[PDB]
Short mmCIF file of N, CA and C in Angstrom, two decimals:
data_model
loop_
_atom_site.label_atom_id
_atom_site.label_comp_id
_atom_site.label_asym_id
_atom_site.label_seq_id
_atom_site.Cartn_x
_atom_site.Cartn_y
_atom_site.Cartn_z
N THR A 1 0.93 -1.15 0.14
CA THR A 1 0.11 0.20 -0.13
C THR A 1 0.69 1.24 -0.05
N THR A 2 0.37 2.32 -0.09
CA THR A 2 0.89 3.90 -0.14
C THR A 2 0.42 4.78 0.47
N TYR A 3 0.87 4.98 1.79
CA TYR A 3 0.79 6.14 2.50
C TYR A 3 0.41 7.48 1.88
N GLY A 4 0.74 8.48 2.47
CA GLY A 4 0.57 9.78 2.18
C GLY A 4 1.40 10.60 1.20
N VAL A 5 2.06 11.88 1.77
CA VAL A 5 2.98 12.23 1.03
C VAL A 5 4.14 11.96 1.87
N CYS A 6 5.50 12.45 1.13
CA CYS A 6 7.04 11.92 1.84
C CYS A 6 7.06 13.48 2.64
N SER A 7 7.03 13.05 4.02
CA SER A 7 7.03 14.08 4.75
C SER A 7 8.60 14.74 5.22
N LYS A 8 9.31 14.20 4.11
CA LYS A 8 10.98 14.41 4.53
C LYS A 8 11.56 14.99 3.17
N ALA A 9 12.23 16.10 3.49
CA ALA A 9 13.32 16.43 2.52
C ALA A 9 13.86 15.30 1.64
N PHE A 10 14.10 15.96 0.35
CA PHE A 10 14.91 15.35 -0.96
C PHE A 10 16.01 15.97 -1.24
N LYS A 11 17.05 15.52 -1.56
CA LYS A 11 18.23 16.33 -1.86
C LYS A 11 17.92 16.09 -3.51
N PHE A 12 18.74 17.13 -4.20
CA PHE A 12 19.14 17.05 -5.46
C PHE A 12 20.46 16.27 -5.85
N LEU A 13 20.38 15.17 -6.59
CA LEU A 13 21.80 14.49 -7.13
C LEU A 13 21.95 14.78 -8.53
N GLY A 14 22.96 15.22 -8.94
CA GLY A 14 23.53 15.76 -10.12
C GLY A 14 22.62 16.79 -10.68
N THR A 15 22.67 17.28 -11.38
CA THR A 15 22.08 18.35 -12.45
C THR A 15 21.04 17.53 -13.24
N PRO A 16 19.66 18.56 -13.05
CA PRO A 16 18.55 18.25 -13.84
C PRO A 16 18.94 18.08 -15.32
N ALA A 17 18.66 16.83 -15.68
CA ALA A 17 19.30 16.30 -17.13
C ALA A 17 17.94 16.82 -17.77
N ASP A 18 18.59 17.21 -19.25
CA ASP A 18 17.79 17.64 -20.58
C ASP A 18 17.59 16.61 -21.28
N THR A 19 16.46 16.21 -21.59
CA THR A 19 16.02 15.03 -22.56
C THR A 19 16.59 14.92 -23.60
N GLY A 20 16.25 16.44 -24.34
CA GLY A 20 16.63 16.76 -25.60
C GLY A 20 14.94 17.14 -26.24
N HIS A 21 14.01 16.22 -25.63
CA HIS A 21 12.46 17.05 -26.28
C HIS A 21 12.59 18.42 -25.62
N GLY A 22 12.20 18.38 -24.28
CA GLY A 22 11.67 19.47 -23.75
C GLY A 22 11.37 19.19 -22.34
N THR A 23 11.81 18.14 -22.21
CA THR A 23 11.81 17.83 -20.40
C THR A 23 12.90 17.85 -19.76
N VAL A 24 13.37 17.23 -18.47
CA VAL A 24 14.43 17.09 -17.69
C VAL A 24 13.89 16.14 -17.14
N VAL A 25 14.98 15.06 -16.53
CA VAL A 25 15.10 13.99 -15.56
C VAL A 25 15.68 14.56 -14.15
N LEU A 26 15.13 14.12 -13.16
CA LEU A 26 15.56 14.39 -11.78
C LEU A 26 15.85 13.06 -11.06
N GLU A 27 17.23 13.25 -10.57
CA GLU A 27 17.84 12.19 -9.74
C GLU A 27 17.69 12.53 -8.39
N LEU A 28 16.45 12.01 -7.84
CA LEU A 28 16.26 12.28 -6.49
C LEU A 28 16.52 11.34 -5.65
N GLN A 29 17.36 11.80 -4.45
CA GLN A 29 17.44 10.85 -3.32
C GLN A 29 16.52 11.25 -2.27
N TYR A 30 15.67 10.44 -1.56
CA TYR A 30 14.89 10.96 -0.35
C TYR A 30 15.41 10.36 1.15
N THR A 31 15.34 11.34 1.89
CA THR A 31 16.30 11.30 3.45
C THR A 31 15.18 10.61 3.94
N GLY A 32 13.81 10.53 3.86
CA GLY A 32 13.06 9.83 4.39
C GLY A 32 12.94 8.56 4.74
N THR A 33 12.20 7.55 5.64
CA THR A 33 12.06 6.25 5.86
C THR A 33 10.42 6.12 6.31
N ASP A 34 9.50 7.38 5.88
CA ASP A 34 7.96 7.03 6.23
C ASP A 34 7.61 6.32 4.70
N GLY A 35 8.50 6.46 3.49
CA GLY A 35 7.91 5.76 2.15
C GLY A 35 7.73 4.30 2.66
N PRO A 36 6.79 3.53 1.87
CA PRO A 36 6.07 4.26 0.35
C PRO A 36 5.28 5.56 0.78
N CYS A 37 5.81 6.75 0.09
CA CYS A 37 4.90 7.81 0.00
C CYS A 37 4.74 8.64 -1.30
N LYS A 38 4.17 9.62 -1.07
CA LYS A 38 4.19 10.26 -2.51
C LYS A 38 5.02 11.61 -2.49
N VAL A 39 5.74 11.60 -3.46
CA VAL A 39 6.56 12.60 -3.53
C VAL A 39 6.08 14.20 -4.07
N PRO A 40 6.07 15.35 -3.09
CA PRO A 40 5.60 16.48 -3.51
C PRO A 40 6.40 17.55 -4.28
N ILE A 41 6.26 17.11 -5.30
CA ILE A 41 7.04 17.83 -6.59
C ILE A 41 6.15 18.35 -7.62
N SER A 42 6.63 19.36 -8.13
CA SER A 42 5.73 20.18 -9.27
C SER A 42 6.64 21.07 -9.99
N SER A 43 6.24 21.39 -11.14
CA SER A 43 6.97 22.49 -12.25
C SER A 43 6.21 23.74 -11.83
N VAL A 44 6.61 24.88 -10.94
CA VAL A 44 5.69 26.15 -10.81
C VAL A 44 6.67 27.06 -11.66
N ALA A 45 5.82 28.24 -11.81
CA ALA A 45 6.60 29.34 -12.58
C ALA A 45 7.57 30.04 -11.59
N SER A 46 7.22 30.09 -10.40
CA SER A 46 8.13 31.26 -9.74
C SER A 46 8.00 30.54 -8.08
N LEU A 47 9.13 30.60 -7.19
CA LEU A 47 9.21 30.48 -5.82
C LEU A 47 7.51 31.23 -5.04
N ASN A 48 7.18 32.03 -5.80
CA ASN A 48 6.10 33.13 -4.86
C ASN A 48 4.75 32.17 -5.33
N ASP A 49 4.57 31.68 -6.38
CA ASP A 49 3.39 30.84 -6.85
C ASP A 49 3.46 29.42 -6.91
N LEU A 50 2.91 28.61 -6.52
CA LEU A 50 3.11 27.31 -6.54
C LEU A 50 1.99 26.62 -7.40
N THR A 51 1.61 27.55 -8.17
CA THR A 51 0.27 27.05 -9.20
C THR A 51 1.14 26.10 -10.13
N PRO A 52 0.97 25.05 -10.38
CA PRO A 52 1.79 24.22 -11.29
C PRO A 52 1.70 24.80 -12.63
N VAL A 53 2.51 24.62 -13.42
CA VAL A 53 2.59 25.40 -14.39
C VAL A 53 3.37 24.44 -15.98
N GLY A 54 3.67 23.58 -15.13
CA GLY A 54 4.64 22.33 -15.99
C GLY A 54 3.54 21.30 -15.96
N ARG A 55 4.13 19.92 -16.46
CA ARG A 55 3.38 18.70 -16.26
C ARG A 55 4.49 17.68 -16.25
N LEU A 56 4.20 16.59 -15.44
CA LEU A 56 4.95 15.54 -15.08
C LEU A 56 5.02 14.36 -16.29
N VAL A 57 5.75 13.81 -16.43
CA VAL A 57 5.78 12.48 -17.41
C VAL A 57 5.99 11.43 -16.83
N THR A 58 6.35 11.32 -15.59
CA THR A 58 6.35 10.17 -14.63
C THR A 58 5.21 11.07 -13.69
N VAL A 59 4.09 10.45 -14.10
CA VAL A 59 2.86 11.00 -12.92
C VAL A 59 2.86 10.45 -11.66
N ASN A 60 2.60 11.12 -10.54
CA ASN A 60 2.29 10.53 -9.50
C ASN A 60 3.56 9.73 -8.96
N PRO A 61 4.75 10.61 -8.94
CA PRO A 61 5.79 10.32 -8.06
C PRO A 61 5.80 9.37 -6.74
N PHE A 62 6.44 8.09 -6.75
CA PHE A 62 6.35 7.11 -5.60
C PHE A 62 7.72 7.06 -5.07
N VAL A 63 7.99 6.81 -3.71
CA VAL A 63 8.97 6.53 -3.29
C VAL A 63 8.86 5.17 -2.48
N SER A 64 8.84 4.22 -3.29
CA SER A 64 8.33 2.66 -2.65
C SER A 64 8.91 2.07 -1.76
N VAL A 65 10.16 2.56 -1.10
CA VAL A 65 10.68 1.85 0.02
C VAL A 65 10.85 2.59 1.21
N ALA A 66 11.06 1.76 2.19
CA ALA A 66 10.80 2.63 3.54
C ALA A 66 12.22 2.21 3.87
N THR A 67 13.17 2.42 3.32
CA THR A 67 14.74 2.63 3.88
C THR A 67 15.38 4.13 3.32
N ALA A 68 16.04 4.47 4.14
CA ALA A 68 16.37 5.96 3.95
C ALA A 68 17.52 5.93 2.70
N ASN A 69 17.43 7.09 2.32
CA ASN A 69 18.38 7.55 1.10
C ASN A 69 18.24 6.56 -0.12
N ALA A 70 16.81 6.36 -0.23
CA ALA A 70 16.64 5.83 -1.53
C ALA A 70 17.14 6.56 -2.91
N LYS A 71 16.05 6.42 -3.74
CA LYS A 71 16.65 7.25 -4.96
C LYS A 71 15.46 7.08 -5.99
N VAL A 72 15.03 8.11 -6.28
CA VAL A 72 13.98 8.21 -7.59
C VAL A 72 14.48 8.99 -8.86
N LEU A 73 13.71 8.71 -9.84
CA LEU A 73 13.96 9.21 -11.10
C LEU A 73 12.82 9.76 -11.64
N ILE A 74 12.44 10.87 -12.15
CA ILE A 74 11.35 11.59 -12.41
C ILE A 74 11.47 12.19 -13.37
N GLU A 75 10.85 12.03 -14.72
CA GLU A 75 10.79 12.99 -15.65
C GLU A 75 9.81 14.12 -15.73
N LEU A 76 9.91 15.05 -16.14
CA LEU A 76 9.56 16.18 -16.17
C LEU A 76 9.16 17.37 -17.38
N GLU A 77 8.03 17.48 -17.52
CA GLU A 77 8.20 18.81 -18.70
C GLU A 77 7.63 20.10 -18.22
N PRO A 78 8.85 21.48 -18.23
CA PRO A 78 8.36 22.49 -17.88
C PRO A 78 7.57 23.23 -18.72
N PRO A 79 7.73 24.37 -18.36
CA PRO A 79 6.75 25.46 -19.31
C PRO A 79 7.91 26.22 -19.91
N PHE A 80 7.78 26.82 -21.27
CA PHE A 80 9.05 27.57 -22.05
C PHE A 80 9.32 29.03 -21.32
N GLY A 81 10.45 28.93 -21.13
CA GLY A 81 11.01 30.28 -20.32
C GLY A 81 11.66 29.80 -18.89
N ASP A 82 11.51 30.59 -18.09
CA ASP A 82 12.11 30.29 -16.82
C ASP A 82 11.10 29.54 -15.82
N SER A 83 11.51 28.29 -15.15
CA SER A 83 10.44 28.07 -14.31
C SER A 83 11.29 27.01 -13.22
N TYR A 84 10.59 26.93 -11.77
CA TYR A 84 11.50 26.60 -10.95
C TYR A 84 10.93 25.15 -10.51
N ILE A 85 11.95 24.25 -10.49
CA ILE A 85 11.48 22.65 -10.13
C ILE A 85 11.47 22.48 -8.56
N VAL A 86 10.24 21.97 -8.40
CA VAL A 86 10.02 22.24 -6.30
C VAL A 86 10.05 20.99 -6.12
N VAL A 87 10.48 20.45 -4.99
CA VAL A 87 10.22 19.40 -4.23
C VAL A 87 10.18 19.54 -2.93
N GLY A 88 9.12 19.13 -2.24
CA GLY A 88 8.88 19.09 -0.69
C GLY A 88 7.84 20.10 -0.42
N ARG A 89 8.03 20.94 0.87
CA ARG A 89 7.25 22.00 1.16
C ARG A 89 7.49 22.21 2.60
N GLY A 90 7.31 23.64 2.83
CA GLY A 90 7.63 24.10 4.58
C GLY A 90 9.39 24.34 4.16
N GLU A 91 10.08 23.90 5.28
CA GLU A 91 11.45 24.35 5.65
C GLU A 91 12.22 23.01 4.99
N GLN A 92 11.52 22.14 4.47
CA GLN A 92 11.94 21.14 3.57
C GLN A 92 11.90 21.37 2.32
N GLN A 93 10.86 21.76 1.69
CA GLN A 93 10.71 21.96 0.18
C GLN A 93 12.21 22.54 -0.56
N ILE A 94 13.01 21.68 -1.28
CA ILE A 94 14.03 22.52 -2.19
C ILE A 94 13.74 22.77 -3.22
N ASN A 95 14.55 23.62 -4.30
CA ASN A 95 14.41 24.55 -5.04
C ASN A 95 15.41 24.69 -6.41
N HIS A 96 15.01 24.33 -7.81
CA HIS A 96 16.10 24.24 -8.36
C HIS A 96 15.22 25.00 -10.05
N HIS A 97 16.18 26.05 -10.58
CA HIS A 97 15.88 26.66 -11.29
C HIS A 97 15.98 26.29 -12.70
N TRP A 98 14.93 26.23 -13.63
CA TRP A 98 15.45 25.88 -15.19
C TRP A 98 14.92 26.67 -15.90
N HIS A 99 15.64 26.60 -17.36
CA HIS A 99 14.92 27.67 -18.17
C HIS A 99 15.00 26.62 -19.94
N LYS A 100 13.94 26.85 -20.09
CA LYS A 100 13.48 26.08 -21.43
C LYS A 100 13.66 26.73 -22.42
N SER A 101 15.00 26.94 -23.70
CA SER A 101 14.83 27.52 -25.02
C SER A 101 14.23 27.32 -26.13
#
Protein backbone atom coordinates (compact mmCIF):
# COMPACT_ATOMS: atom_id res chain seq x y z
CA THR A 1 0.00 0.00 0.00
CA THR A 2 1.00 3.67 -0.31
CA TYR A 3 0.65 6.13 2.56
CA GLY A 4 0.33 9.86 1.92
CA VAL A 5 3.02 12.31 1.01
CA CYS A 6 6.70 12.02 1.90
CA SER A 7 7.17 14.15 4.99
CA LYS A 8 10.91 14.36 4.58
CA ALA A 9 13.18 16.41 2.35
CA PHE A 10 14.86 15.18 -0.81
CA LYS A 11 18.26 16.19 -2.11
CA PHE A 12 19.13 17.10 -5.69
CA LEU A 13 21.59 14.51 -7.05
CA GLY A 14 23.47 15.52 -10.16
CA THR A 15 22.04 18.31 -12.29
CA PRO A 16 18.55 18.18 -13.87
CA ALA A 17 19.09 16.30 -17.12
CA ASP A 18 17.72 17.76 -20.38
CA THR A 19 16.18 14.91 -22.40
CA GLY A 20 16.40 16.73 -25.70
CA HIS A 21 12.59 16.82 -26.13
CA GLY A 22 11.70 19.60 -23.74
CA THR A 23 11.74 17.67 -20.52
CA VAL A 24 14.18 17.14 -17.68
CA VAL A 25 14.98 14.09 -15.59
CA LEU A 26 15.53 14.54 -11.90
CA GLU A 27 17.80 12.33 -9.85
CA LEU A 28 16.27 12.50 -6.42
CA GLN A 29 17.45 10.92 -3.23
CA TYR A 30 14.94 10.72 -0.33
CA THR A 31 16.21 11.34 3.22
CA GLY A 32 13.01 9.85 4.55
CA THR A 33 11.93 6.43 5.74
CA ASP A 34 8.19 7.06 6.00
CA GLY A 35 7.80 5.79 2.44
CA PRO A 36 6.13 4.32 0.50
CA CYS A 37 4.94 7.87 0.11
CA LYS A 38 4.15 10.36 -2.61
CA VAL A 39 6.78 12.85 -3.76
CA PRO A 40 5.57 16.48 -3.38
CA ILE A 41 7.09 17.82 -6.54
CA SER A 42 5.74 20.15 -9.19
CA SER A 43 6.95 22.46 -11.97
CA VAL A 44 5.87 25.96 -10.94
CA ALA A 45 6.55 29.33 -12.55
CA SER A 46 8.18 30.96 -9.52
CA LEU A 47 8.95 30.42 -5.84
CA ASN A 48 6.15 32.89 -5.06
CA ASP A 49 3.39 30.93 -6.74
CA LEU A 50 3.07 27.18 -6.36
CA THR A 51 0.33 27.03 -9.02
CA PRO A 52 1.57 24.19 -11.26
CA VAL A 53 2.66 25.38 -14.73
CA GLY A 54 4.54 22.38 -16.00
CA ARG A 55 3.49 18.74 -16.24
CA LEU A 56 4.95 15.39 -15.10
CA VAL A 57 5.70 12.63 -17.58
CA THR A 58 6.36 10.24 -14.77
CA VAL A 59 3.03 11.04 -13.13
CA ASN A 60 2.19 10.51 -9.45
CA PRO A 61 5.81 10.20 -8.20
CA PHE A 62 6.46 7.32 -5.76
CA VAL A 63 9.13 6.55 -3.18
CA SER A 64 8.37 2.82 -2.97
CA VAL A 65 10.72 1.86 -0.12
CA ALA A 66 10.92 2.43 3.60
CA THR A 67 14.74 2.63 3.88
CA ALA A 68 16.54 6.02 3.95
CA ASN A 69 18.51 7.62 1.13
CA ALA A 70 16.63 5.68 -1.51
CA LYS A 71 16.58 7.19 -5.01
CA VAL A 72 13.99 8.28 -7.52
CA LEU A 73 14.09 9.21 -11.17
CA ILE A 74 11.31 11.50 -12.31
CA GLU A 75 10.88 12.94 -15.81
CA LEU A 76 9.25 16.35 -16.10
CA GLU A 77 8.15 18.80 -18.76
CA PRO A 78 8.54 22.42 -17.68
CA PRO A 79 6.89 25.41 -19.37
CA PHE A 80 8.82 27.50 -21.91
CA GLY A 81 10.94 30.17 -20.30
CA ASP A 82 12.08 30.33 -16.70
CA SER A 83 10.65 27.83 -14.23
CA TYR A 84 11.34 26.44 -10.75
CA ILE A 85 11.32 22.69 -10.09
CA VAL A 86 9.98 22.25 -6.57
CA VAL A 87 10.30 19.24 -4.29
CA GLY A 88 8.94 19.11 -0.76
CA ARG A 89 7.33 21.92 1.20
CA GLY A 90 7.87 23.99 4.30
CA GLU A 91 11.44 24.36 5.55
CA GLN A 92 11.80 21.07 3.69
CA GLN A 93 10.96 22.03 0.13
CA ILE A 94 14.06 22.09 -2.08
CA ASN A 95 14.34 24.33 -5.14
CA HIS A 96 15.97 24.31 -8.55
CA HIS A 97 15.71 26.77 -11.41
CA TRP A 98 15.41 25.70 -15.02
CA HIS A 99 15.20 27.44 -18.39
CA LYS A 100 13.61 26.06 -21.55
CA SER A 101 15.07 27.50 -24.79
